[PDB]
Amino acid sequence: GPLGSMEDFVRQCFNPMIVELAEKTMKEYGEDLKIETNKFAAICTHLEVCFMYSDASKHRFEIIEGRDRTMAWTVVNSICNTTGAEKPKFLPDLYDYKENRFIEIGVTRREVHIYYLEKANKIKSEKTHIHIFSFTGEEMATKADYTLDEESRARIKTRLFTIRQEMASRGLWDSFRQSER
Ligand SMILES: [Mn+2]
Ligand SMILES: [Mn+2]
């Protein structure tokens, strides 16, 4: 019953652009992706989920995730200067053009209401919509408003499902699940 390397899995079941954005993301904090390999996969995963979330409806969302902080804040500032909206204190992951609000996407290996509540306490602003996903098909969103339809979110959760089980087949899942706090 062999145990695999998380880094290899990350470089084998994730798209090279995703991986590059993850590497850049960790580098911008100086973190080494060889000490924090579960964080590497968590970031690749979160990235992919945000991207799929935007892909579910083209021309509806603006992506903030994966950008430089300078540029991401530039986009946020532009949007808010266009709408007059409150500049959130923390960088959100998306902007919904249809409901005209910012979205924070969270992905958790733990219970979704816990992650949701921790996000809610952390981000201060009650104007930023929150959407949390798990690797087990569970999701938790603000005001029971899930933005996307069932098929799209099922697409996302199916991808997550795949990630989790492909992790499992390499023995990576237990440590990855345990690593969160
Ligand atoms: Mn983010
Ligand atoms: Mn997020």
From Swiss-Prot:
Q: Which residues of the full protein are shown?
A: 1 to 196 of 716
**So where does Mn(2+) 1 get bound?**
H46, D93, E104, I105
The record describes its quaternary structure and partners as:
Influenza RNA polymerase is composed of three subunits: PB1, PB2 and PA. Interacts (via C-terminus) with PB1 (via N-terminus).
Question: Could you say which protein family the record assigns here?
Answer: Belongs to the influenza viruses PA family.
Annotated compartments: Host cytoplasm; Host nucleus
Q: What is this protein called?
A: Polymerase acidic protein
Function, in words: Plays an essential role in viral RNA transcription and replication by forming the heterotrimeric polymerase complex together with PB1 and PB2 subunits. The complex transcribes viral mRNAs by using a unique mechanism called cap-snatching. It consists in the hijacking and cleavage of host capped pre-mRNAs. These short capped RNAs are then used as primers for viral mRNAs. The PB2 subunit is responsible for the binding of the 5' cap of cellular pre-mRNAs which are subsequently cleaved after 10-13 nucleotides by the PA subunit that carries the endonuclease activity.
Q: What does UniProt say on post-translational modification here? A: Phosphorylated on serines and threonines by host kinases, including human casein kinase II.
Per the record, the domain of life is Viruses
Amino-acid positions noted as binding Mn(2+) 2 in the UniProt annotation, renumbered to this chain: E65, D93
Motif stretch (Nuclear localization signal 1 (NLS1)): 109-124
